[PDB]
Amino acid sequence: GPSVFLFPPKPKDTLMISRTPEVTCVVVDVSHEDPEVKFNWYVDGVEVHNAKTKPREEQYNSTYRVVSVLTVLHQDWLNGKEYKCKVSNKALPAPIEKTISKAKGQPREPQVYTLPPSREEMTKNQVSLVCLVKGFYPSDIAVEWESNGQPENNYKTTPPVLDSDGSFFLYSILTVDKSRWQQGNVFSCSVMHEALHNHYTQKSLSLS
Amino acid sequence: GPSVFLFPPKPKDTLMISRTPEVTCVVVDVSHEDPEVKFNWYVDGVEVHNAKTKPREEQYNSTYRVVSVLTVLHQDWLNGKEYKCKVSNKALPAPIEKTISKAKGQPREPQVYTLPPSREEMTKNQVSLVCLVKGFYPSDIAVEWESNGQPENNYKTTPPVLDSDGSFFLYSILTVDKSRWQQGNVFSCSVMHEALHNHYTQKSLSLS
Amino acid sequence: DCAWHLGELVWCT
Amino acid sequence: DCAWHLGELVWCT
């Protein structure tokens, strides 16, 4: 039948006041015969009406996709506000209900450590700089890399891993040209988590 | 003082029998004055001795990093085997103990859906193909993209998000040149999770 | 107290 | 039953 996904907003969006965090309700496998979908949005029970309604999108075994995006307020989500999407379709026994909300629990700050390139690492054309992060709750986090107030996009970051005490850890590796590193350029590890003063911290790293 | 991280192995490594899953014990902020570190590895209590011992690595306020990697057995980790690292240093009040193990719980299969490019999407130079995955437990998963048995590396995948029933969901977006998509080429969404027959499933996607 | 990320406003206290 | 990923062996049953 028609399946539904309700996605939380990018943690950056929720922690960056200059950005629009949005919850997203995706409906897939809607039929050619019964295409209309009605969305109902609720914030802790109270219905709300501002949601955007995107047009249908061609899919596969003569199907459609429909998405409705609802903006949220930085402080709202952060507070623990529960968001509910209600999907209705003539092909639905009952209307489907999805519930997303920031994880409840006593918040904790991420500890951040940096690892410069090893000796073997330093023989290659491209060296990788590494960033370790632990003891954070909840798992929603954004880690990015910069150098001289410009973004560095050549990195991967592992999903948060559950720790035995309830907090979360991860690592992120940025790869760069050895010359850029040899030149003296500073590279910074930007961590945004709710439990950081102003949501922002940054460890940096250079030779030697 | 000296902090310790014990990392689980890449979920691909653990699900790919042609690969070496390994648990990793990173020790950071080791001092120039007291550098020696002794690792002790335990598997459900029973000590084991095969671990590799990498050399020290220059760090910052006259510090070092030391890592010890221990191989694990695919079926071992999968079984629920608990792994323990014991770090010892003359600067340690007591020796530090870290514990990692595959999350216990009744396993569940990922459901996978694909979203082809929207109409607006189809006007750009580069279209993105999307892959939705839900109802999986535990959260350890690997999603990659291929086309014609070659890897496609231009994708990002969101960390697993906790669902209200205990399972996990995520999405992944691959971006490609419109011509490659217009040409008729199939693009596949490879999902590896423990609860898949042979750890492997694949939804694909092409025009029109 | 305001923090910035790549010239974009993060947060104020 | 064996599954393969980019020519590398995933799993057998």
Q: In order of start, what are the domains of chain A with their CATH numbers?
A: 2-101 (2.60.40.10), 102-208 (2.60.40.10)
Q: Whole-angstrom distance between the N-terminal and C-terminal Cα of chain A?
A: 60
- Cα separation, A44 vs B206, in Å, equals 41
Residue in B146, B150, B200 closest to D10 by CB: B200
What count of CB pairs under 8 Å joins A to B?
Answer: 68
Reference A13, options A27, A23, A26, A25; nearest CA is A23
Buried b (16+ CB within 10 A) or exposed e, A108-138: bbbbbbbbbbbeebeeeeebbbbbbbbbbbb
All partners of chain C with 3 or more CB pairs under 8 angstroms: A
Nearest by CB to D12, from B146, B149, B198: name it. Answer: B198
Structure-block tokens of residue A160:
């948060």
Spatial separation of the C-alpha atoms in residues B114 and B188, rounded to whole Å = 9
Q: Which chains touch D (3 or more CB pairs under 8 A)?
A: B
Please check whether residue B17 is in contact with residue A181, taking contact to mean a CB–CB distance below 8 angstroms. Answer: no
- Min distance B198 CA to chain A CA atoms (Å): 23
Q: Report, in this order, helix, strand and coil percent for chain B, each rounded to 5.
A: 10, 50, 40
Q: Choose, out of C2, C5, C9, the residue to mutate when testing the contact with A (most A CBs < 10 Å).
A: C5
Sign of CA dihedral A205, B1, B2, B3: negative
Residues of chain A contacting C12 with CB distance shorter than 8 Å: 17, 198
Of the partner residues D6, D7, D13, the one whose CB lies closest to the CB of residue B198: D13
Q: Which two tokens stand for residue B14?
A: 């653990």
Helix (H, G, I), strand (E, B) or coil at A50: coil
Asked whether the beta carbons of A104 and A80 are under 8 A apart, the reply is yes
What's the number of CA atoms in the CB half-sphere (13 Å) around residue B36?
2
State the DSSP H helix or E strand holding residue A175, giving kind and residue range, or none if neither: strand A168-177
Cβ contacts of A172 within 8 Å, gap of 6 or more: A130, A131, A133, A143, A145, A155, A156, A157, A158, A189
Q: How far is CA B182 from CA A51, A132, B120, B121, B174, in A?
A: 33, 42, 15, 13, 15
